[PDB]
Design a protein around this ligand. Structure first.
Ligand SMILES: O=C(O)C[C@H]1CCCC(=O)C1
Ligand SMILES: O=C(O)C[C@H]1CCCC(=O)C1
Ligand SMILES: O=C(O)C[C@H]1CCCC(=O)C1
Ligand SMILES: O=C(O)C[C@H]1CCCC(=O)C1
Ligand SMILES: O=C(O)C[C@H]1CCCC(=O)C1
Ligand SMILES: O=C(O)C[C@H]1CCCC(=O)C1
Ligand code: NI
Ligand code: NI
Lengths: 250, 250, 250, 248, 248, 248
């Protein structure tokens, strides 16, 4: 096929792009809802870089598969996080994944297709957030494991919910429904499961009518402050998280 | 009359100030709702500077005329925005208008008297925002023209609505009613059209009972962060906007 | 008793800590709701430093006594605030109280037991905010006295309510009920008076199950931006406030 | 010529066909005596300069043997009264904002002693000094008030945060040669050659396209503007409190 | 060896058993001619270097008598067209981000004239130069476009916000000795000894534990990264507008 | 005299009628051996100094022939255990915060080698050194851990972001004369004259009104405080990870 090589380079991402440069990127594990792994932690930064480098991507839709956006993780596959020499890989990849995802230089629409229980900081880099009615949001794994929620959730959830409710949400592992997230201005439209992707594409097609440089530079203008905020705290959060992972040996 | 010369220097601004130093500044075009022009883009920065320099202004009320705050623009009068040598004037004036409006050193009350479809970033520099029931807010012209919403809306709407709903609002050209804006904490009171100005003056009179230096330094204290945020992004937004205007020739 | 010496060092703070390292700190004046004084303005920074230094404090609950959190102040006891040589003490202590309260290195739960009419910026340093049904919030004293609300309220209320409603709230001395504050995401749970402290302890006990370093470093991660924002504006607010206090002599 | 060329009793203006504007501070043709009037009017003059797109390069200089070495202290008003200091405070924020907002390269031709208001020089892009020049923050610690008018930000930027604080706290005086070694002054010239050199540099710059002059100035002043904004109001409020304390 | 060692026609790679990687820029074995190709590929190369944990110290150098003194201007594409400049803009942000994100100490061995892209050198931790080296921002004011590609941030960081602006606005040339005195160059070596010294320094560093090399690099680049991020996109957008204006 | 004057086994305090406080670090009257105890107690001492409004100028110095050249490594506790390092981390943030929060001018009298904890000196306003003084970041790269305790921020501030990184990564040693040339040291004195000069400078300062001393210190440390706050916790967390890695 005439499509870019990177479209089929990632076992856990499906890519489809229309003639308008609207790219839908769908996370999956063997076609089912994603199980997050060491492999995805390593590869996703590269995938987001590849998407960002390709000037034929004019709008991006980021979504998951099945009835969850991301609700499963294969903890052992992440490597021995209690060993700082292994955590350093995770730390490096944690800084790159958000840098590279922010550096996508066109509007990014999240189509949140169900529970987002980990790695919801990805959603919080995107410009328009649509959620199916069954969606819930939670920072599940960190306080389950006893390690710092230091991978960007610590910056982006307090930006989303404000520095009061955002800290309550993280410290208590609060779960928000799609409707709550909508009232909290995180989700912008709540859709039936059967209509979520159609609506994402409809918004994308309207955006695609813009001149290319306008799509790109509006994205730049609207992400400057967000990038500064992420850069401020991402490395420190992930370093603190690494120390708490080490401490699990104590 | 004994009033300052600058009160009658601006064809598109009416000025009235009471014995308490409460200054009402009303935008108009021949007494009707304002039609924004190259002339206002050039003169408004000077008007806001003049207001800020005059220590007899103790509270400012900024409003429009008729049934719209600002809903019309004479696009050709702005000059050839696709020519960078002409856009540079617009760029320079775009940085000065927000700098000078923020540097008004007393509380500023917005009395939003109807549709605010362009230049709503002015409202988002002010301290107390009142709106008539017929008011709506939208960033109309930028994505209509295909150029970046880079004149301060890119900073101030995400500050107002948060960095999620704020980006949705700009990318989709969302229109908010006065009631929606009130629920979103942008508008602080929604008034009947017939009561808007009376309420602005009532709030102003309460404020005017404060010592002058308290009015001034409370304004300073409450605008430090806002000024930093505007300075961060205003020039870059307007430069990106200029490039997209040039690109319309392609 | 085996408890730390600092537990009984402060006439206006009662301390109680359980075997899980959950420390409840309760402000009082002779067992009644606190009357804020020059003495508390001077001592509270030391108390918060002492709490922060003690690694046996694993979660902190900060509360008041009786039916108000803080609703009274003995103005004369603050010293001659109109004399810059006296205000300088207040200025120095104003910077230290927020620095030291932020530097508590474990989650801090506010249990707001009634009206918080002054010094609510303390609450706005904490991570989880619970309020009894009778609670109200207001910046009462500053615009009553004619001096700048420059002690941290100018930073933290606009962070809590956004830079629009936050400035309206301060300039108009708005009073918010517990229910309003809950809708505004400042208060996270509204409790009957009889259940407030039980709920604070229940949340604390859940948190106390975390590893110690996770409690500490999650607090660090979630307060980096907050600390930067407070540092940006606290000294300038308090200096401006001092000038307005001097001006009361004019 | 523009009306503003003759609006300011303490500034002479001359502009050539290339858009090179020389702005010369003076008191009756002599070295400037700084006053309440200049404190109030200079922000307006710098704004007027910045608004005029026909200015393509700016040279800012003084008159006679000193760039600025004199001040009429009573003419600043009763600085010990916060209501009067507030004028000075507002004007002190505006002067640096408006000076930095000149949107073309600015050359300082420092024609002798700069003992006050040297922060103006530290907004400029190319700094030339005559061999007789000395730099000092004279007035603040002489009067017992904070050096809070931008010197507190820009001298530590120029000399680093170590020598910059020594310079301010001890009211150190720097010769032109020392300032050159410290990278503040870029060329040291004989008095009789200073202005010719300033104009030579300006002519070379003026050969650039106008947008390049403007946007190179913008690019090279972003960080500088942020740093001044961070500290200027706080420094001037603290200074005001120390001025009030002169009554005690 | 890694695949990326042979992916870049203008970069030679050699790595020893200690994880010391030497990256040498060249055009057919000679001193680099900078091109549209290098502008596009170098960001990828620096990313690839940064991803590879077997790199424990990096030495970045040029070939022949110059570090970088040549550029094929037409090969950069039609910079006066905003749609083409946008590629240069995106690549200009990525090159510095990816270079700064190399997570080990980086030694510059500057093997002669660095007349363009010297901002790469100003991301590195230890700067060595051969005695023949000169530094200049040559191309920008030659072409009439903003020096907006990071030189506008990093030269004023290196030389201070006074000499740094003089250096850019006048296209000043600095010898290796001047740059040494200005604390930009840390050791000046004969041409024939430069690379041996770079490798000696690298060997001493390589004795550190790997996490120490990595986290010392992180600690020492936090502020630097913030400063570059502040200004890089704005500088490159302004530069693009001046490139467009070359048509007028 | 205040109780805190005798609370610290490693600090001697002496204050004159002008409010000039000399704080001298020592171990049994000799040059300081830095310990876990000093790491824990110094933050409290600096807080106590800062709280006491009778301190109008502070001189911070060492004893004997060295300012700080010795450390009892085992006394710092088992730094390789994150639960123990956390104490060092918390204390490392507090020491610089509390030292910077001294609200009057601070004079460093550096009485010889400063081989560790030189970041304390880099919080002070006027830096004097005896001719025998040398500066180095000795311990971090000797132990294989990040120089993350503020040296990573303040040395690059002092020497610039180029020479500052060379100095840290190579554990460069600077003589008093070099440090003077680099604008870190402001006066170089014979050993026998150092303290007299410190007190002379302090006496001149002490003639200022108290609020002026305080608010000039505030004005001149705003930026410095921001820079330290930006990086101190991150540097100390990274350092802790490298300390843990010493087990591997
Ligand atoms: O995916 C990550 O961010 C790293 C994992 C490592 C294992 C425990 C977690 O939940 C986080
Ligand atoms: O008023 C402005 O900000 C400039 C105009 C220029 C023409 C197109 C627009 O809507 C914006
Ligand atoms: O408690 C304070 O912050 C200082 C007081 C001083 C007296 C007037 C006030 O309300 C504030
Ligand atoms: O010129 C100024 O900045 C104002 C004056 C204020 C009074 C004494 C001075 O030297 C400075
Ligand atoms: O190499 C670059 O950064 C791009 C070019 C753009 C055109 C002229 C130049 O010298 C710089
Ligand atoms: O004194 C310190 O900052 C702590 C120690 C930590 C262990 C080895 C060192 O040299 C630094
Ligand atoms: Ni912010
Ligand atoms: Ni800086």
């Amino acid at each position: 096929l005439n499509q870019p090589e990177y479209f089929t380079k990632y076992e856990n991402l499906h890519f489809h792009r229309d003639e308008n440069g609207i790219l839908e990127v769908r996370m999956h594990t063997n076609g089912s809802s994603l199980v997050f792994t060491g492999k995805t932690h390593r590869e996703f930064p590269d995938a987001f870089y590849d998407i960002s480098r390709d000037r034929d991507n004019r709008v991006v839709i980021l979504t998951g598969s099945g009835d969850a956006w991301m609700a499963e993780i294969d903890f052992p596959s992440l490597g021995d996080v209690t060993n700082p020499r292994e955590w350093d890989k995770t730390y490096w990849e944690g800084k790159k994944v958000l840098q590279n995802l922010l550096d996508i230089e066109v509007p990014v629409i999240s189509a949140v297709n169900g529970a987002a229980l980990l790695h919801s900081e990805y959603i919080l880099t995107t410009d328009i957030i649509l959620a199916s009615e069954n969606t819930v949001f939670q920072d599940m794994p960190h306080l389950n494991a006893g390690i710092v929620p230091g991978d960007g959730v610590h910056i982006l959830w307090p930006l989303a919910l404000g520095l009061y409710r955002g800290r309550y949400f993280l410290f208590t592992q609060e779960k928000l429904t799609a409707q709550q997230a909508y009232e909290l201005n995180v989700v912008h439209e709540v859709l039936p499961q059967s209509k979520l992707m159609e609506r994402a594409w409809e918004i994308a097609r309207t955006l695609a009518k813009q001149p290319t440089l306008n799509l790109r530079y509006t994205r730049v203008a609207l992400t400057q402050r967000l990038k500064r905020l992420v850069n401020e705290g991402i490395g420190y959060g992930l370093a603190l998280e690494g120390i708490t992972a080490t401490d699990l040996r104590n």
